[PDB]
Every structure is written in structure tokens, then in C-alpha cells.
Write a protein that binds this ligand. Structure first.
Ligand code: MNR
Length: 152
């Protein structure tokens, strides 16, 4: 798990995201969709988005970004004590949405990229290490639920 110091870094970085939840959420999703177009196909509501311009201009995409990062933020604030929060997400993403764990790897990488892009020189080596750990914990706990379900 993460140390106390590491959690404090994670939640410090998260303060940056909370100042513009929609903006961060939008850029995370755009980074995901442009970098991995197959991910767009998982969203009936975004598969019409043919271009990044269209993505950028989609208010519904920004809305979904807000939903996504709010759920993640709730999880992070549990500092690993997130069974109740993570379980339903694992379950909807395996059973309803059919999201392979690879796609969660993709979006983890996207969050790290977006943090550097929006805060260049203000996302330190230590902060990246701690946020990366937190994201991997999230992914790893989901992967455990995926194995339970025999998904992917
Ligand atoms: C590659 C695609 C997927 C990735 C990666 C992904 C990663 C993540 C993620 C990691 C940080 C968080 C947090 C996250 C959180 C959510 N997510 Mn998700 N998610 N996610 C979807 C695809 C994906 N998610 C699909 C598709 C829906 C249904 C969208 C709709 O039509 O409303 C969805 C829905 C949701 C919902 C709405 C409630 C529900 O359905 O469980 C939340 C909350």
C-alpha cells in the first residue's frame, strides 16, 4: 500500500484536479480516446465524435469527465479503504460496460500525462511516484474483482 506521506502527496496533487474537475476530466478522456480509439467504441454516446475538435466541443464529454474524476477522487480520499466504492465500479465495468483492464491502464497513463501537461514543472518526481502508486492500487483492486468474475 501507500505510506502516509505518499497518501498526503496523492491528495495534494488531487487538489490541483479539484480546481478544474471538468477541464481535467475532459483532457483525460480526450487523451484516452485519441491515443486509443478503440476505447471510444465502448461509448455509444461518444462514438459520433469523429475529430478531437468535436471531442473538445462536446459538453456531454466534459460532463462524463466530471463524473469519472469525481468517482476517482472519492476513491482516492479513502486512502486504500475503498472496497465499498470500488466494488460497484469493478462490477459495472466488467459486466455492463465490458472494459478490459488494459483500458484502465490506458486511462491511468492518461491522468499522469494530463497532470504534467496542465501543471508542467509543478508535478514533482515524488508526486508522480505517489499518484502512480494510487492509480495502480485502484487498477489492481479492480483486476482482483475482474478475476473473481472471470472477465477478460
Ligand atoms: C475505456 C472505457 C472505460 C474506462 C477506462 C473507464 C474508466 C473509468 C474510471 C477510471 C478512473 C472511473 C473512476 C470510471 C467511473 C465511471 N464510469 Mn467508466 N470509469 N464508464 C465507461 C467506460 C470506461 N470507464 C462506459 C462505456 C460507461 C457508461 C457510459 C454511459 O453511457 O453513461 C462508464 C460509466 C462510468 C460511471 C457511471 C456509473 C457506472 O456505470 O458505473 C462512472 C462513475
Amino acid at each position: 500500500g501507500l505510506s502516509d506521506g505518499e497518501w498526503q502527496q496523492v491528495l495534494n496533487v488531487w487538489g490541483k484536479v479539484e480546481a478544474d474537475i471538468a477541464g481535467h476530466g475532459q483532457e483525460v478522456l480526450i487523451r484516452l480516446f485519441t491515443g486509443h480509439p478503440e476505447t471510444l467504441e465502448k461509448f455509444d454516446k461518444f462514438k459520433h465524435l469523429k475529430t478531437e475538435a468535436e471531442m473538445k466541443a462536446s459538453e456531454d464529454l466534459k460532463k462524463h469527465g466530471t463524473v469519472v474524476l469525481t468517482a476517482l477522487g472519492g476513491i482516492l480520499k479513502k486512502k486504500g479503504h475503498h472496497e465499498a466504492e470500488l466494488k460497484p465500479l469493478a462490477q459495472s465495468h466488467a459486466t455492463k460496460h465490458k472494459i478490459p483492464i488494459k483500458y484502465l491502464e490506458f486511462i491511468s497513463d492518461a491522468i499522469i500525462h494530463v497532470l504534467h501537461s496542465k501543471h508542467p514543472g509543478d508535478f514533482g518526481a515524488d508526486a508522480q511516484g505517489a499518484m502512480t502508486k494510487a492509480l495502480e492500487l485502484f487498477r489492481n483492486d479492480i483486476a482482483a474483482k475482474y478475476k473473481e468474475l472471470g472477465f477478460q
